[PDB]
Amino acid sequence: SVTVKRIIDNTVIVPKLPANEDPVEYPADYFRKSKEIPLYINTTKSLSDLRGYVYQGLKSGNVSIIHVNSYLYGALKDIRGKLDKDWSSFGINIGKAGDTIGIFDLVSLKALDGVLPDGVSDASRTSADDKWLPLYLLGLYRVGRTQMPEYRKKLMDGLTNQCKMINEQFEPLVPEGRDIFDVWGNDSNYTKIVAAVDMFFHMFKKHECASFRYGTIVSRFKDCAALATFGHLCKITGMSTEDVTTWILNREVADEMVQMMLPGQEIDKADSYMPYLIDFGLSSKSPYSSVKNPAFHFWGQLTALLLRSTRARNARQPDDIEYTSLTTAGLLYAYAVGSSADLAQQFCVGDNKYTPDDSTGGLTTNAPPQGRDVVEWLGWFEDQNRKPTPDMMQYAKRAVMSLQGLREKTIGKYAKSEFDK
Amino acid sequence: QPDDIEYTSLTTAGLLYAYAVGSSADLAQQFCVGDNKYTPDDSTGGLTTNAPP
């Protein structure tokens, strides 16, 4: 904040903008409040009742999410796994050494209270349904989160996996059924169920019920896109996470990087509560999303695309960011990784290695740096008066040209529209 | 596009502003490893005038 005035009459003006809080909640800021996450569930009805309850509830349009949660608890309740090593996360020892824990050892079971639906129960529904009826209920958490109709081939592959469980499986949903389970993701207990499923079977990848992860896998790192593009950029370039952190040349991307790299959230631990910080209600606004970290998503995604990424073509272009500066940064970074291939011999036969020649005294100056050091490429870029050279724009053109089938509002169409002319 | 405004002068002002933001990327190193930052060179004295700020 600095004093601003109008020169014509020295009148003082105070330029200010409508503010938006939107504070961000980290997972560690939750377990210092409560040392356990509760799951509200109703344990009055029996298993065999709930089976037909949600079967005939599925066949029609009416179904209670309390019935599908209270049924998922009974169906998945008596499942176990022995740990090979200690399991603990955020100061919570859910297991220890050779303990044999269950899926719901991750959350503390509480009790839901209130009126219960009648539920048009059905009998003659044997136990083999519980071999796949959870897998169904779980998978519809995934299908219900995509709004493109063509994309709901996930329901067909769910039909494939259940049809693998029972050869004669057939979707107990009307074609209107796509309206039914969409609201299922709104019951916090349901999300606390799928997150517990995927968090469970992520430790036990050998278990015979690992197929249940289908549908729940979208719960891991849900609303955590930018953190994934950081690994994508750390994979496409080939540079360590620190070296890539040095190539951040924008203020917003740096602030968002510090926001993402807060050192108390276990983003490097394998089996932790962090990837499920949204469904577990650990956070209402994620710190690792492409909504609160737009400049980093645009920057890393564009830099990845210029380096021949097949994933980056369809990433979305966020709004209200410095497209110009971010594009010059991704252009310099991308041209630096593309030019400096850094080829070096790795194996030798007669213990004869490539010995470089230092006697090259011709002084080939005004040439790009030899490696990928930010310090050198910034100076070389200052020799070009901070304007991209024609070889840089031609490098980007040769990378974004021959890009076909580009969706709107994507960074692929952005780079194609920016460099191919 | 609103009516009854000075389209020409406004377009020139927005042109100079957009060209200024587009030209001046203002790239600057943000993170460092071995405490080595970009130190610009001040020994450039060929008089590279007639260049945008």
Epitope: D358, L363, T364, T365, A367, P369, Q370, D373, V375, E376, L378, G379, W380, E382, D383 | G34, N36, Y38, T39, P40, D41, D42, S43, T44, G45
Partner: nanobody, 125 residues
Framework: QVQLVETGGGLVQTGGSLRLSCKAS????????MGWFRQAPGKERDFVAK????????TYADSVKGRFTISRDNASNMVYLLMNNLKPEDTAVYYC??????????????????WGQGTQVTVSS
């Protein structure tokens, strides 16, 4: 394995002359600014001379203008400091300095990522 190796120091009388050699190795210094610094006994290291890569543009310290001639050879990867008309004020430990590519070199020491172990220069009456 980048390193700067300084030779040529020693003890001389007032008015004598020395020649300091600096063998730079490990990488390429085509777009690098090379330099010399000196550390007085009990004092922080100070600037004496730097030679750039742009037309061999040289910058000297006021304490050595007219007495030291800095030069470089890219074909031999060497940097020389010619010390004529010496003084006891010049008694110090001289280090060779090198800079990353297209990175600036400042008299205070800013820039200059690479340094050597240095050599001893003692000037008596």
């Amino acid at each position: 394995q980048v390193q700067l190796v300084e030779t040529g120091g020693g003890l001389v009388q007032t008015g004598g002359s020395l020649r300091l050699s600096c063998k730079a190795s490990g990488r390429t210094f085509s777009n690098s600014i090379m330099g010399w610094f000196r550390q007085a006994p009990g004092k922080e290291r100070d600037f004496v001379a730097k030679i750039s890569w742009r037309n061999d543009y040289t910058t000297y310290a006021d304490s050595v203008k007219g007495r030291f001639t800095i030069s470089r050879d890219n074909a031999s990867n060497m940097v020389y400091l010619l010390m004529n008309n010496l003084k006891p004020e010049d008694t110090a430990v001289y280090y060779c300095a090198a800079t990353k590519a297209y990175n600036g070199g400042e008299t205070s020491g800013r820039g200059f990522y690479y340094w050597g172990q240095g050599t001893q220069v003692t000037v008596s009456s």
